[PDB]
Ligand SMILES: CN(C)c1ncc(Cl)c(Nc2ccc3c(c2)CC(=O)N3)n1
Ligand SMILES: CN(C)c1ncc(Cl)c(Nc2ccc3c(c2)CC(=O)N3)n1
């Protein structure tokens with residue numbers, strides 16, 4: 001999971 | 005396009 | 009093999025499937041969650057959820073145009089997860105994380121359950 | 132928004148759609164190319180091709196279970212492109228590049244046409  |  | 013690969017292809021496919029959903033094009037099922045109705049593509053639901061995968065591979069349920077979820081399922085939690093299925097983006101917030109995790113456990117969306125468990129453990 | 136994103140989600144969705152295709156699950160159309168028949172999901176074809184997008188948004192053609200392609204279309208070129216649609220992988224070879232480019236131009240798959248033009252220019 002990432003900060004888009 | 006890339007070499008997978 | 010000696011194939012070449014187009015990096016953005018999967019993301020572009022998902023973006024177009026979401027455009028079809030937003031315009032209600034070729035949607036073939038309505039998911040009923042309490043009073044709320046959500047139109048979707050059976051194939052996308054199966055690709056994202058262990059529960060829908062099991063439902064639509066069933067020789068009788070594969071032909072249903074309406075699927076009713078367990079009454080304990082929260083419509084907002086389902087809406088956030090349906091949006092995630094079609095975008096890869098999860099709107100996870102303090103006020104919805106418990107409903108999102110419970111819905112993801114029911115839908116059998118293992119990666120969502122994992123990030124909810126980690127975000128809850130941090131707080 | 133304040134969303135989080137799962138990097139591998141789009142690729143995982145496409146992988147599962149290809150698993151459904153390989154098992155012939157929820158396929159809703161057969162594409163006829165000369166003597167050859169290819170089963171697929173209308174939504175995936177639309178998401179990948181400007182030609183299929185136009186065909187299946189048409190109020191009459193959206194209901195057809197069989198689509199016949201132009202007799203000039205090569206079945207192998209179509210097969211390579213159908214595999215690309217479901218995997219992001221293009222089996223581009225010296226012996227098939229002309230048939231692949233011609234099929235991609237007909238199917239309106241702009242990124243495939245672009246890589247074929249570049250590979251032809253290099254040789
Ligand atoms: C497991 N399998 C062969 C498969 N093939 C095709 C599809 Cl659409 C599919 N989808 C599916 C099954 C289980 C799970 C998911 C999708 C997401 C998840 O967390 N569990 N799973
Ligand atoms: C253009 N548009 C709004 C849109 N929405 C949904 C879908 Cl499924 C779609 N697909 C499509 C249209 C044109 C092209 C492609 C897909 C690939 C391409 O090279 N051209 N295009």
Ligand SMILES: [Cl-]
Nearest residue numbers: 117118119120
């Ligand atoms: Cl997931």
Ligand SMILES: [Cl-]
Nearest residue numbers: 240241242243
């Ligand atoms: Cl393309």
